[PDB]
Design a protein around this ligand. Structure first.
Ligand SMILES: [Cu+2]
Ligand SMILES: [K+]
Ligand SMILES: [K+]
Ligand SMILES: [Zn+2]
Length: 105
């Protein structure tokens, strides 16, 4: 299954929408650039299962997305550890533009 997360709410709020997503192995999360760009998607090393920097760096899309409809996807395959992956947008960090993917297992 694919879950679409908007970067910037339709309401014009600096939020990921939905901010919290629960996922099963094999699912994809697709971020779509929506309102009030730019946005990016950063996972800190201590905010993914096992605190793996190698994992968090692979998943982080640090490059800025400016155009509506730009997208980035992660397929959380069985290669991914179960647990929480907490992320944020650097440009809007002070606005609380944060999210969390929970991979069940
Ligand atoms: Cu943002
Ligand atoms: K993070
Ligand atoms: K940062
Ligand atoms: Zn860190």
């Amino acid at each position: 299954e694919t879950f679409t997360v908007k970067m910037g709410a339709d309401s014009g709020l600096l939020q990921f929408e939905p901010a919290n997503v629960t996922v099963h192995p094999g699912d994809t999360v697709k971020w779509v650039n929506n309102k009030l760009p730019p946005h990016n998607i950063l996972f800190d090393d201590k905010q993914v299962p096992g605190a793996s920097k190698e994992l968090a760096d692979k998943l982080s899309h640090s490059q800025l997305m400016f155009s509506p409809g730009e997208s980035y996807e992660i397929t959380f395959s069985s290669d991914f550890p179960a647990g929480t992956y907490t992320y944020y947008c650097a440009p809007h960090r002070g606005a609380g533009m944060v999210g969390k993917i929970t991979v069940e297992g």
